[PDB]
Design a protein around this ligand. Structure first.
Ligand SMILES: [Mg+2]
Length: 102
RNA sequence: CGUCAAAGCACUUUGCAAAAGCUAACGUAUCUGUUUCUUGCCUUUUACCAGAAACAGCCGUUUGUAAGGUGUGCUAAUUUGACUGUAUAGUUUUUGUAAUCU
């Protein structure tokens, strides 16, 4: 939409906020929630997150349920951990990659 | 204006109590009386004259508080008080130069 000026009042700030998820990079979380797709998320401490994303924030603060979480580290040994539900601060996100359900 | 708290709220009637503390208008107003002195006019008393000191009375004022009245409400209205009250991922704090090993 034709208002990326970044000098906006509240109504147009909200308009750009919704448009950004309508079409921008963060749009992937929208149809990831709607389609309930597998998403792999990596934190900044080299931790792996696979789960459904029930909801997400504009700051990418996402609530995750059914997380498949693995961390690696003696000899390199891979270990996993399943948590039913979690709230993730968008600060620690490095990447999200969607695994299409179909 | 905002958040929180408790109080129904606005107007009004009556009772009770208090009203200088750091020199200052309870009242930006203003009367009367008693006692003790000093005076004026004076034939004697009341009524008087005009100054002071110490006391009182009356016409009023303000605040607090208690119980009521009227009109509106409790399916909300208003008032009083308190408050470290506001946005914001793009360098000076809160949307990460992190993890890695030592
Ligand atoms: Mg005689």
């Amino acid at each position: 939409v034709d208002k990326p000026r970044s000098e906006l009042s509240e109504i147009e700030l909200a308009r750009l906020e919704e448009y950004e998820f309508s079409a921008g990079p963060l749009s992937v979380l929208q149809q990831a929630v709607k389609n309930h797709d597998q998403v792999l998320i990596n934190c900044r401490n080299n931790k792996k997150l696979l789960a459904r994303v029930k909801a997400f924030d504009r700051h990418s603060n996402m609530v995750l349920e059914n997380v498949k979480e693995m961390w690696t580290e003696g000899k390199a040994i891979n270990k996993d951990r399943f948590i039913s539900k979690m709230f993730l601060r968008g600060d620690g996100v490095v990447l999200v990659v969607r695994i299409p359900s179909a």
